Design an enzyme around this catalytic site. Structure first.
Site, PDB file in Angstrom:
ATOM      1  N   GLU A 212      83.464  74.882  44.926  1.00 27.51           N
ATOM      2  CA  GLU A 212      84.031  74.428  43.944  1.00 27.51           C
ATOM      3  C   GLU A 212      84.347  73.138  44.678  1.00 27.51           C
ATOM      4  O   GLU A 212      84.988  72.608  43.674  1.00 27.51           O
ATOM      5  CB  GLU A 212      84.618  74.400  43.462  1.00 27.51           C
ATOM      6  CG  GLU A 212      83.498  75.754  41.971  1.00 27.51           C
ATOM      7  CD  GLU A 212      82.688  74.957  40.826  1.00 27.51           C
ATOM      8  OE1 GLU A 212      82.565  73.399  40.579  1.00 27.51           O
ATOM      9  OE2 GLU A 212      81.470  75.670  40.106  1.00 27.51           O
ATOM     10  N   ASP A 221      81.788  63.895  41.401  1.00 31.45           N
ATOM     11  CA  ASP A 221      80.945  65.008  42.298  1.00 31.45           C
ATOM     12  C   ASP A 221      80.036  64.608  42.330  1.00 31.45           C
ATOM     13  O   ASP A 221      79.278  63.588  42.305  1.00 31.45           O
ATOM     14  CB  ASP A 221      81.245  65.848  40.121  1.00 31.45           C
ATOM     15  CG  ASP A 221      80.383  66.138  39.310  1.00 31.45           C
ATOM     16  OD1 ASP A 221      80.262  64.567  39.988  1.00 31.45           O
ATOM     17  OD2 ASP A 221      80.263  66.432  38.504  1.00 31.45           O
TER      18      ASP A 221
END
Ligand code: Y01
Ligand code: Y01
Ligand code: Y01
Ligand code: Y01
Ligand code: OIN
Lengths: 445, 69
Positions: A212, A221
């Site tokens: 992550e 993201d």
């Protein structure tokens, strides 16, 4: 009247000089090998250095004078030598347990606060920790043992004997055992128990950290949504002003887009607890999670962390195989998934985690199992040589006279044997002490 | 003393006090009681007879005012 002594004092008397030499030489090795070898200078070993300093005082002064006193039946070294022997023994023994607390807490904070605690885990602050531990040990016992006779105005210790004057009451010796031994042992056992359960969570942290990412500032993201920390989505709104406000909601602080190292860990714990809680409420994921081991539950937590509870529940054949302990066959099914085709390498790492049952796709954990074994050895060697005397002082407080005199001398003595075997544990556990000891004893430095 | 007799009184590790002996107790005792090897329970006070000295006990008796200090 001739005195027929028991074989125990003969055992103690003969071996004490021999164990004294083994204690001092073995503890001089850790001292000198720490100065000769710069690679032994790891924070874990700095604590071990302080234990060796306490073990050296026991092996030089405490152990030998005990056996002379034992074998003569009285203290013939004067009133000042008695006070110094008692002080050195209790201060060194207290420094031991105070250190063992520090080692225990250090592992605890290293595992429960992987990013925060290790960020400030420097050989300088560990010196302050060791320095304060030896300071409180001194202030507690040294001025009291040396100057209590001056405080009450009289020396009530028996003329031919040697003991602490303000412990000359049976109930006080009970309290000292509870406070100086039983209280530190219980907190070390509870820290040791929590470490066992928390290292599973520590590994999940490092697992998700590389999958992550880790950023302390807001970023977009792979799908364009604002994110911070370890995969913590802040908002799906295109405006980052909402992202700053959402960050101010989870973190009760004016962040202005940035968080601290402590704040990142808090968000990760909230997200991974929400992930495992999503697993537990699902009827399809309830049996498989319970059946799997710690390493494979982490891979399942990873998938849930990535997709969600309802996303991972759809893999009915794969779940039906993981609960059925068919790892190679379940690995090829999850490759058929749309999840496999969308993330490039995270899926393959999670696959190899299920089939191998190891962390090899993420990290080795060969250095850390070694250090954990070093911890387990020094604590267990402390328990096996200190609880006998302490279970005796316990039953001695309640039972009038049912613990023999020979056992008191053994139990009191066995506490000294701990100092002798700490270097042995070091060379047996740490293979860098083992090799550095060989070049010093063979004169190859 | 003549008629009256005051002994040092001690049952703890703190400062000692003084006890006036009741009638029938004409001695001051200073008593180290053995429990475990380095353990001696230290008491001082008044008594009619000197306590029985057991294994590894040291008991000093006297009949003077505050002679068991
Ligand atoms: C090379 C040397 C330095 C290493 C061995 C030293 C000690 C570990 C050895 C040497 C003499 C041994 C002792 C020799 C004789 C006895 C008597 C023996 O007594 C009995 O068996 C019964 C006693 C009884 O019934 O009263 C108990 C073991 C003991 C203390 C032995 C214990 C172990 C000792 C001290
Ligand atoms: C005299 C009795 C009452 C107590 C004796 C205690 C000693 C065993 C202690 C007290 C001070 C300690 C020393 C104080 C500071 C250092 C510096 C330290 O240096 C380093 O590790 C840095 C690297 C290097 O210089 O090699 C090595 C341990 C040492 C010698 C300690 C070794 C153990 C010592 C001598
Ligand atoms: C004699 C009894 C009563 C007290 C014995 C005290 C020692 C056990 C303590 C006191 C001073 C401490 C030392 C003081 C400073 C150092 C240097 C420190 O080295 C570093 O900070 C690494 C960076 C650098 O070398 O500058 C590591 C801890 C150490 C060895 C400490 C280890 C434990 C020591 C020797
Ligand atoms: C420093 C290490 C590497 C070597 C030395 C080990 C000793 C600390 C161990 C090995 C043998 C053990 C002893 C073996 C047998 C007994 C008899 C056992 O039962 C009795 O003493 C009988 C009851 C009585 O007569 O009092 C009490 C523990 C004791 C002394 C053990 C105490 C701990 C000992 C001495
Ligand atoms: C002087 N004692 C210390 C070293 C030899 C003896 C036996 C041990 O006694 C204890 O275990 C007690 C607690 O019961 C203790 C006193 C002071 C510090 C730590 C433990 C430590």
């Amino acid at each position: 009247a001739p005195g027929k002594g028991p074989w125990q004092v003969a055992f103690i008397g003969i071996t004490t000089g021999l164990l004294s030499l083994a204690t001092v030489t073995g503890n001089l090795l850790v001292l000198i090998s720490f100065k000769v070898n710069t690679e032994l200078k790891t924070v874990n070993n700095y604590f071990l250095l302080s234990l060796a300093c306490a073990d050296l005082i026991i092996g030089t002064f405490s152990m030998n004078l005990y056996t002379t006193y034992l074998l003569m039946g009285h203290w013939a070294l004067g009133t000042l030598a008695c006070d110094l022997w008692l002080a050195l023994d209790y201060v060194a023994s207290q420094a031991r347990v105070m250190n063992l607390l520090l080692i225990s807490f250090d592992r605890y904070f290293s595992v429960t606060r992987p990013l925060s605690y290790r960020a400030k885990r420097t050989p300088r602050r560990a010196a302050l920790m060791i320095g304060l531990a030896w300071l409180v040990s001194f202030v507690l016992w040294a001025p009291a043992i040396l100057f209590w006779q001056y405080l009450v105005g009289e020396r009530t210790v028996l003329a031919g004997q040697c003991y602490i004057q303000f412990l000359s009451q049976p109930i006080i010796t009970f309290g000292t055992a509870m406070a100086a031994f039983y209280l530190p042992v219980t907190v070390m056992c509870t820290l040791y128990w929590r470490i066992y359960r928390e290292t599973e969570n520590r590994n999940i942290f490092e697992m998700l950290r590389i999958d992550e990412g880790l950023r302390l500032k807001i970023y977009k993201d792979t799908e364009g949504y604002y994110t911070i920390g370890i995969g913590h989505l802040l908002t799906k709104s295109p405006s980052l002003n909402a992202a700053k406000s959402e960050l101010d909601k989870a973190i009760g602080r004016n962040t202005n887009g940035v968080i601290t190292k402590d704040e990142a860990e808090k968000l990760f714990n909230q997200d991974v607890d929400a992930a495992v809680r999503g697993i537990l409420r699902n009827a399809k994921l309830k049996p498989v999670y319970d059946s799997l081991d710690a390493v494979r539950r982490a891979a399942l937590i990873n998938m849930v962390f990535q997709m969600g509870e309802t996303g991972v529940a759809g893999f009915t054949n794969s779940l039906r195989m993981l609960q059925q302990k068919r790892w190679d066959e379940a690995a090829v099914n999850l490759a058929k998934s749309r999840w496999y085709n969308q993330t490039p390498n995270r899926a393959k790492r999670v696959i190899t985690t299920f089939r191998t049952g190891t962390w090899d796709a993420y990290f080795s954990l060969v250095k850390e199992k070694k250090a954990a074994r070093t911890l387990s050895a020094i604590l267990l060697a402390f328990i096996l040589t200190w609880t006998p005397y302490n279970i005796m002082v316990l039953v001695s407080t309640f039972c009038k006279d049912c613990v023999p005199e020979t056992l008191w001398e053994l139990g009191y003595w066995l506490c000294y044997v701990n100092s002798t075997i700490n270097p042995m544990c070091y060379a047996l556990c740490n293979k860098a002490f083992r090799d550095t000891f060989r070049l010093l004893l063979l004169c190859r430095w | 003393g003549p008629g009256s007799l005051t002994c040092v009184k001690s049952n703890s590790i703190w400062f000692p006090t003084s006890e006036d002996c009741p009638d029938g107790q004409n001695l001051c005792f200073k008593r180290w009681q053995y429990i475990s090897p380095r353990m001696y329970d230290f008491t001082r006070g008044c008594a009619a007879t000197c306590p029985k000295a057991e294994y590894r006990d040291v008991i000093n008796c006297c009949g003077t005012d505050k002679c068991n200090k």
